[PDB]
Design an enzyme around this catalytic site. Structure first.
Site, PDB file in Angstrom:
ATOM      1  N   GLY H  16       0.692  -3.839   8.147  1.00  0.00           N
ATOM      2  CA  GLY H  16      -0.556  -3.353   8.681  1.00  0.00           C
ATOM      3  C   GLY H  16      -0.324  -2.480   9.886  1.00  0.00           C
ATOM      4  O   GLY H  16       0.598  -2.724  10.660  1.00  0.00           O
ATOM      5  N   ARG H  48      -3.775 -12.698  -0.848  1.00  0.00           N
ATOM      6  CA  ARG H  48      -2.348 -12.425  -0.882  1.00  0.00           C
ATOM      7  C   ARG H  48      -1.550 -13.704  -1.037  1.00  0.00           C
ATOM      8  O   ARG H  48      -0.476 -13.680  -1.645  1.00  0.00           O
ATOM      9  CB  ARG H  48      -1.909 -11.691   0.386  1.00  0.00           C
ATOM     10  CG  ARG H  48      -2.148 -10.189   0.368  1.00  0.00           C
ATOM     11  CD  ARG H  48      -3.580  -9.825   0.686  1.00  0.00           C
ATOM     12  NE  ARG H  48      -3.821  -8.397   0.608  1.00  0.00           N
ATOM     13  CZ  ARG H  48      -3.586  -7.552   1.599  1.00  0.00           C
ATOM     14  NH1 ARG H  48      -3.085  -7.990   2.745  1.00  0.00           N
ATOM     15  NH2 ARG H  48      -3.842  -6.266   1.433  1.00  0.00           N
TER      16      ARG H  48
ATOM     17  N   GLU I 173      -8.888  -4.345   7.647  1.00  0.00           N
ATOM     18  CA  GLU I 173      -8.418  -4.233   6.280  1.00  0.00           C
ATOM     19  C   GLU I 173      -6.947  -3.918   6.401  1.00  0.00           C
ATOM     20  O   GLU I 173      -6.575  -2.752   6.388  1.00  0.00           O
ATOM     21  CB  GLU I 173      -9.210  -3.155   5.568  1.00  0.00           C
ATOM     22  CG  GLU I 173      -8.915  -2.944   4.110  1.00  0.00           C
ATOM     23  CD  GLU I 173      -9.528  -3.966   3.202  1.00  0.00           C
ATOM     24  OE1 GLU I 173     -10.589  -4.516   3.558  1.00  0.00           O
ATOM     25  OE2 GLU I 173      -8.952  -4.211   2.121  1.00  0.00           O
ATOM     26  N   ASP I 174      -6.133  -4.961   6.570  1.00  0.00           N
ATOM     27  CA  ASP I 174      -4.690  -4.866   6.817  1.00  0.00           C
ATOM     28  C   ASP I 174      -4.374  -3.983   8.023  1.00  0.00           C
ATOM     29  O   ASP I 174      -3.713  -2.953   7.918  1.00  0.00           O
ATOM     30  CB  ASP I 174      -3.942  -4.366   5.579  1.00  0.00           C
ATOM     31  CG  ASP I 174      -3.901  -5.387   4.475  1.00  0.00           C
ATOM     32  OD1 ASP I 174      -3.885  -6.594   4.778  1.00  0.00           O
ATOM     33  OD2 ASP I 174      -3.887  -4.984   3.294  1.00  0.00           O
ATOM     34  N   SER I 175      -4.888  -4.386   9.177  1.00  0.00           N
ATOM     35  CA  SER I 175      -4.481  -3.803  10.443  1.00  0.00           C
ATOM     36  C   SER I 175      -4.458  -4.922  11.468  1.00  0.00           C
ATOM     37  O   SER I 175      -4.911  -6.034  11.197  1.00  0.00           O
ATOM     38  CB  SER I 175      -5.394  -2.658  10.874  1.00  0.00           C
ATOM     39  OG  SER I 175      -6.668  -3.140  11.206  1.00  0.00           O
TER      40      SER I 175
END
Ligand SMILES: [Zn+2]
Ligand SMILES: [Zn+2]
Ligand SMILES: [Zn+2]
Lengths: 48, 96, 48, 115, 48, 46, 258, 124, 186, 67, 47, 48
Positions: H16, H48, I173-175
């Site tokens: 990320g 996930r 969102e994936d950060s």
């Protein structure tokens, strides 16, 4: 050859006429922001 | 899960309770060795643990045979994801 | 905007406490795996 | 590269007002106070002090964006009572209790170090 | 020199883009028509 | 006008000329390292 | 319509930390005093590093970084120093800076530790804090050296984290959550706080709706750059100064409107 | 220097970019002075299914408190999560690594109890 | 070109790796008792993939030589440790059996891309695109196999106090939200 | 490489602890005893020494290029 | 005798002895070693 | 498919699901903090 210059996906029709390199365009990573509206993108200064 | 934002009931069942049967091509883990799946099992062993059923959960962790069978199912998923892309893009190009 | 700023007051996480069931549930899970595993073994001895 | 310099959190520039008053037009007796180059460490105390007046009907603040250093304190007070008066009384009440707190902290140090 | 920086009506000025300019924003692969949409520019400091 | 280079393995220093083959005098070692500049550097300690 | 009267009760005072209790104030006042401990207290830290020579294995910007984070004794000078960008001097002076000089060459087969002791001030009050051992800046092999001149200047924790005087500011209100701000799923599993006063039979306190956050417990551990009580005094003075300048600009804007 | 857009990752495929960088006074904090260094999404976990990230975080609290570099070989059976929790409970923490964070802006303590602790992050 | 791996050797239902081998093998650099002396002792041997089709392989000895309701009781070899089925990048993952397997594959991709001190003589090397790190740390949560890849000597990454929290909405969102003061401390 | 001057989370000065930490390890303490003998209560300050690798001692083996 | 339940520390001793004896790249080094020691002579004589 | 494509993404969606439950109550200060972020608010605090 000439036919090999034209026939490819990297050729003249598809590679240069259909999809071509354009000026006035930027490409950088996106990171989220919930403090701006849905039709706003926050671009950098050095892009702008 | 209840909000539907991220995940499903299957992920809760696999984290808490049991991962479940691992599959390769829609059936169980095939006999890659001579009539056994891994060299730790006796030959002609059609049981749960021999053929890829994982009874552990992700909270407890998998035993190495269950780890390897789980890696097989995951490799099948990644093969699907990597092979799908070009064919779907070419179908889109022909349609447009 | 306003639901993120309520979420600062509320707070939302996920943890390893959210992945552990009480021991009665683990006993139910292990009893069900043992019952189904013995059932597969008796299907196998019928098949032989 | 595009890193804003570290003095953008608190230093103003030529042509920047520290405080900007804009009279709200939606409801009577309400103002937006735009404070430039501050953060939650000012507006949170001002919001909590403005909630202690019996004559403030609405006391809030927001940052528009955490990368841009400004807050907006919206004040709606009761009619006959200007929100600018409530704001300049909130600042004086904070300075009052913080100076009192500092003096009591001095006295507590003199108690502790001298037994 | 400053003598030819005058402006009368009819010149063009290629100016750096500000807030409120419109841009097109997309992601390869552009699958459908909402994979390439128009946003308004907001100038934010960092480089994303 | 000569440039001082540090003689790689030898760690000694020597002059050099324009259009000069790059050789040490101590053992003829071929890799020279240019000395650190003489103008000032200043670092913000951030 | 007015400010409540807070009060202070100090439980301990050590050369590292101070532990105290502030009663009869609001939550936002208390959180802001914490945030002004972390950020708005000005100390003296190195910000201008001129590397005259360097042969060490660490490169130049790494050494200037490590010289940034060294705490300096600024217990009484930082009230006298002007901010560097505010001074009318020829870009550096002893009224907005403290000069440091390091000049170390290793002439021995032992690994020579360039520590914080080799920083030599011209001001005898502003020296690095290091009973305890010195702060290791860089090790040196024989043959290597470093010479540098480093100016330290006044700044605070919003600007950079090398101007942060506090090691740790523990802050808690209502340690048995009678307010029920946090909602434990199973409060039996939860350990009691240091300031809990419930017996071991009871898990958490009974709820009161009419209560409000008061009796804020702080533990301010300094890094050594200031005494842990002058962090608190400087923080209260800085917060009152920020509010007073906000009031002055407010008076100017009101006089501009009328 | 790490800025936003810089891509970090765990040891579990939990990558990320950096969304934002807050200062220390804005970051939340425990009953002690400990703020996070990273704050990751809770929604990155459940689809996930990297439970090993959570167990690494729990064993990291146990390891950093006990003063030993903890063991995470895969097929062990001498380390499950219940033994990790019983080792964590002795150092005055919650059984499952949750810890009451206070908010960094308002100071009001967060109603949920935030899972916190040390993992091992990789800068890509 | 065949591909083998060493396995222990199991006579009747007993390992041949006795306590005296561990006693001579702990005291290396003194007895000069190597791995090759243990291959010479007839205790381990290399089994390739053809021969794995004709071997009865115990997973671990603590389960699979003790009498029970017996599975086979005809073991020939025993696996040394199951963690040695993994590669070099899948060995640096803590608890990789608790993950899902695409996540293990994705970390095996990312572990090749992490910055870190890639070599010890990096100041001599004129590499193009060298990414090195200021203060790399060994993992607090490590495997036993990192001792043999020497990951605790040239590590890649820093131990960080993460928290898993929904917050202002920049870890969406994936950060991830980072600490500016921590980053200012290197 | 070399020990950080401050703990990343707190800012506790941990850079002066490393050589004394090595002294307390070689004087036959446990690592957990050595850490709180150095007085590191918070685990974020304990990871700063407990998981440091002192890599600069490898870098000092090489002869300095400039001399 | 045998290793009853200290097996967990006895197997990593033999893993450590393996990777101290062999190392991680015996395939490349031993393959090139047998090449340049035997196989080049075999190519020269088999011509 | 004559439906929207935007929707409400993950963290706003869980926080709005926890927000709109029956047992969620808000103090006056928390309300005034939340109503500060509505762009479309006409300035009238609702009756509790
Ligand atoms: Zn020479
Ligand atoms: Zn000056
Ligand atoms: Zn710390």
């Amino acid at each position: 050859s000439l036919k090999q210059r034209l026939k490819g996906k990297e050729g003249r029709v598809r590679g240069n006429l259909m999809g071509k390199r354009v000026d006035f365009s930027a490409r950088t990573v996106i990171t989220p922001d919930p403090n701006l509206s849905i039709d706003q993108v926050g671009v950098p200064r050095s892009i702008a | 899960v209840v909000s539907g934002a991220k995940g499903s009931k299957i992920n809760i069942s696999q984290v808490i309770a049991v991962v479940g049967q691992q599959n390769v091509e829609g059936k169980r883990i095939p006999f890659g060795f001579k009539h056994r799946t891994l060299p730790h099992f006796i030959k002609d062993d059609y049981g749960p643990e021999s053929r890829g059923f994982v009874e552990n959960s992700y909270l407890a962790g998998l035993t190495p045979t269950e780890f390897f069978f789980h890696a097989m199912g995951g490799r099948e998923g990644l093969i699907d994801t990597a092979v799908k892309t070009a064919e779907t893009g070419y179908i889109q190009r022909r349609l447009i | 905007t306003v639901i993120n700023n309520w979420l600062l007051i509320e707070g939302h996480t996920i943890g390893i406490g959210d992945s552990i069931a009480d021991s009665k549930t683990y006993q139910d899970i292990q009893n069900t795996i043992k019952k189904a595993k013995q059932d597969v073994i008796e299907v196998i001895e019928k098949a032989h | 590269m595009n890193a804003p310099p570290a003095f953008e959190s608190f230093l103003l520039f030529e042509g920047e007002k520290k405080i900007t008053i804009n009279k709200d037009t939606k409801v009577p007796n309400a103002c937006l106070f735009t404070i430039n180059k501050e953060d939650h460490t000012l507006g949170n105390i001002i919001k909590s002090q403005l909630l202690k007046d019996p004559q403030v009907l609405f006391a809030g603040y927001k940052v528009p964006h955490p990368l841009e250093h400004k807050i907006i304190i919206r004040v709606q007070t009761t009619p006959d009572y200007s929100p600018q008066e409530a704001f300049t009384n909130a600042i004086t009440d904070l300075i009052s209790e913080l100076s009192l707190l500092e003096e009591r902290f001095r006295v507590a140090i003199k108690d502790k170090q001298e037994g | 020199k400053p003598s030819d920086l005058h402006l009368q009506t009819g010149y063009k000025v290629e100016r750096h883009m500000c807030d409120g300019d419109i841009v097109i924003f997309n992601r390869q692969p552009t699958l459908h028509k909402m994979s390439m949409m128009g946003h308004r520019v907001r100038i934010l400091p960092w480089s994303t | 006008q000569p440039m001082i280079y540090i003689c790689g393995e030898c760690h000694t220093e020597n002059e050099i000329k324009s259009r000069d083959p790059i050789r040490c005098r101590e053992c003829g070692y071929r890799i020279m390292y240019k000395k650190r500049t003489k103008r000032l550097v200043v670092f913000d300690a951030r | 319509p007015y400010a409540n009267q807070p009060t202070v009760r100090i439980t301990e005072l050590t050369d590292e930390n101070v532990k105290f209790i502030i009663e009869n104030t609001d939550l936002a006042v208390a959180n802001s005093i914490r945030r002004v401990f972390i950020a708005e207290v000005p100390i003296i830290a190195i910000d201008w590093v001129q590397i005259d020579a360097n042969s060490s294995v660490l490169h130049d910007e790494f050494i200037a970084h490590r010289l940034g984070l060294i705490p300096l004794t600024s217990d009484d000078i930082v009230d006298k120093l002007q901010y560097s960008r505010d001074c009318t001097c020829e870009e550096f002076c002893p009224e907005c800076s403290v000069e440091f000089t390091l000049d170390v060459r290793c002439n021995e087969d032992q690994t020579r530790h360039v520590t914080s002791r080799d920083l030599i001030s011209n001001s005898p009050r502003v020296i690095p804090v290091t009973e305890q051992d010195d702060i290791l800046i860089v090790k040196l092999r024989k043959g290597q050296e470093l010479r540098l001149r480093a100016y330290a200047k006044k700044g605070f924790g919003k600007e950079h984290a090398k101007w942060n005087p506090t090691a740790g500011v523990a802050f808690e209100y209502d340690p048995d959550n009678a307010l029920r701000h946090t909602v434990y799923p199973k409060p039996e599993e939860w350990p009691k706080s240091e300031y809990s006063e419930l017996d071991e039979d009871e898990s958490q306190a009974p709820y009161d709706p009419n209560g409000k956050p008061e009796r804020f417990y702080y533990n301010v551990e300094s890094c050594g750059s200031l005494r842990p009580e002058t962090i608190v005094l400087s923080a209260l003075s800085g917060l009152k100064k920020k509010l007073s300048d906000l009031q002055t600009q407010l008076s100017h804007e009101i006089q501009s409107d009328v | 220097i790490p800025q936003i857009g810089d891509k970090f990752a765990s040891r579990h495929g939990q990558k990320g970019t950096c969304g934002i960088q807050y200062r220390q006074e804005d970051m939340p904090f425990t009953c002690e002075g400990i703020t996070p260094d990273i704050i990751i999404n809770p929604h990155a976990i459940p689809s996930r299914m990297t439970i090993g990230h959570l167990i690494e975080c729990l064993q990291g609290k146990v390891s950093a408190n006990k003063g030993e570099i903890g063991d995470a070989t895969p097929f062990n059976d001498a380390v499950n999560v219940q033994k990790i929790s019983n080792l964590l409970s002795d150092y005055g923490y919650h059984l499952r690594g949750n810890e009451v964070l206070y908010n960094g802006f308002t100071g009001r303590k967060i109603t949920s109890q935030i899972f916190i602790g040390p993992t091992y992050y990789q800068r890509l | 070109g065949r591909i083998c791996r060493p396995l222990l050797i199991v006579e009747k239902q007993k390992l041949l790796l006795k306590k005296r081998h561990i006693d001579q093998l702990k005291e290396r650099e003194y007895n000069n008792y190597s791995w090759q002396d243990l291959v010479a002792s007839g205790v381990v041997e290399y089994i390739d993939t053809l021969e794995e089709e004709t071997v009865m392989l115990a997973m671990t000895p603590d389960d699979l030589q003790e009498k029970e309701v017996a599975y086979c009781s005809t073991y020939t070899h025993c696996e040394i440790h199951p963690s040695m089925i993994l590669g070099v990048c899948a060995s640096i993952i803590p608890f990789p059996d608790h993950n899902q397997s695409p996540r293990n594959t994705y970390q095996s991709a990312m572990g090749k891309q992490a910055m870190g001190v890639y070599i010890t003589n990096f100041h001599v090397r004129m590499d193009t695109l060298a990414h090195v790190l200021y203060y790399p740390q060994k993992p607090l949560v490590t495997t036993r196999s990192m001792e043999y890849l020497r990951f605790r000597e040239l590590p890649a990454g820093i131990n960080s106090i993460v928290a898993i929290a929904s917050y202002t909405g920049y870890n969406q969102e994936d950060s991830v939200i980072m600490n500016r003061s921590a980053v200012d401390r290197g | 490489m070399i020990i950080p001057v401050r703990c990343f989370t707190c800012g506790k000065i941990v850079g002066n602890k490393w050589e004394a930490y090595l002294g307390l390890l070689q004087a036959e303490y446990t690592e957990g005893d050595a850490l709180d003998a150095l007085g590191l209560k918070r685990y974020c300050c304990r990871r700063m020494l407990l998981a440091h690798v002192d890599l600069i001692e490898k870098l000092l083996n090489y002869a300095p290029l400039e001399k | 005798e045998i290793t009853p339940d200290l097996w967990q520390e006895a197997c990593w001793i033999v893993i450590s002895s393996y990777f101290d004896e062999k190392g991680l790249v015996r395939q490349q080094l031993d393959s090139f070693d047998e090449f340049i020691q035997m196989s080049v002579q075999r190519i020269v004589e088999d011509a | 498919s004559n439906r929207p494509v935007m929707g409400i993404v993950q963290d706003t969606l869980t926080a709005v699901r926890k927000f709109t439950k029956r047992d969620v109550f808000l103090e006056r200060g928390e309300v005034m903090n939340l109503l500060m972020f509505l762009s479309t608010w006409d300035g009238k605090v609702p009756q509790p």
